[PDB]
Design a binder for this molecule. Structure first.
Ligand SMILES: CCS(=O)(=O)c1ccc(CC(=O)Nc2cc(-c3cccnc3OCc3cccc(C#N)c3)cs2)cc1
Ligand code: NA
Lengths: 10, 252
């Protein structure tokens, strides 16, 4: 969940 | 999808050195000059005792938070690394799940003072006795020994940048879907690292770098000690451990 969010947040 | 997913010329390898070093400088968390300056700021005997008197759960929680802070900078480094964002999301996650802690462990040598065997933790330098409440003496001394061994190489910031890029871009990680794309990116990052060592007459460190099994042993030890802690204080892990830390080391 967190990793997905961190990678998507630009 | 990216230039570094195919064969790169010398000029393109030179560009990769500059890009990797820039990505690292921008995500290094703490400046080397700030860490070096604070070497004289060492925890007192009273302060060490204070940490030793903390409960096992309180110390684990504090350590998990600081490690999570360090991992977040590693995630940013990955995002800025040439070719990483061009990989599929499965592979980005595979690489970060296996490599994030490995990168933090390498980066930690900058915060380690080989002269007095101390590490920068919560504003000051402390020896391994500072972590005695954790109840994972073997893991702590293994991390201190690793940092001591890396410190003996006298890494520059550019060397840490290139080496950590290689720690992260590993085509042998189990679960990679686009393995060939990762292999080519790894090959180019290996050329960038070795080119920089060649250019700065630092190729002598190649035979002195730790074997890949060394970083794996440390990460496996971490996962094992976390599991022991988890069995003893499961609600501490569930309620107070950072969500990212749990996603990486205890499958969510
Ligand atoms: C990285 C970028 S940097 O800019 O070089 C920078 C930025 C900020 C700092 C401060 C900081 O966070 N210090 C810290 C030191 C240690 C630590 C060191 C040695 C041994 N054990 C340690 O933790 C115990 C522990 C507990 C549970 C599991 C595991 C594991 N596996 C380890 C943890 S956190 C330092 C450096
Ligand atoms: Na050091």
């Amino acid at each position: 969940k967190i990793l997905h969010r961190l990678l998507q947040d630009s | 999808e990216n230039l570094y997913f195919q064969g790169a010329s010398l000029t393109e390898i030179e560009h990769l050195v500059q890009s990797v070093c820039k990505s690292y400088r921008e995500t290094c968390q703490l400046r080397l000059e700030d860490l070096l300056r604070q070497r004289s700021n060492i925890f007192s005997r009273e302060e060490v005792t204070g940490y030793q008197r903390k409960s096992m759960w309180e110390m684990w929680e504090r350590c998990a938070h600081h490690l999570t802070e360090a991992i977040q900078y590693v995630v940013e480094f990955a995002k800025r690394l040439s070719g990483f964002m061009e990989l599929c999301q499965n592979d980005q996650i595979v690489l970060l799940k296996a490599g994030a802690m490995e990168v933090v462990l390498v980066r930690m040598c900058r915060a380690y003072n080989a002269d007095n065997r101390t590490v920068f933790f919560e504003g000051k330098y402390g020896g391994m006795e500072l972590f005695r409440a954790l109840g994972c003496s073997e893991l702590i001394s293994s991390i201190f020994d690793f940092s001591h061994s890396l410190s003996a190489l006298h890494f520059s910031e550019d060397e840490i940048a290139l080496y950590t890029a290689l720690v992260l871009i590993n085509a042998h990680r189990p679960g990679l879907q686009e393995k060939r794309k990762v292999e080519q990116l790894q090959y180019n990052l290996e050329l960038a690292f070795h080119h920089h060592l060649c250019k700065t007459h630092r190729q002598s460190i190649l035979a002195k770098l730790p074997p890949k099994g060394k970083l794996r042993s440390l990460c496996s030890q971490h996962v094992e000690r976390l599991q022991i802690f988890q069995h003893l204080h499961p609600i501490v892990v569930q309620a107070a451990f950072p969500p990212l830390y749990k996603e990486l080391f205890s499958g969510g």
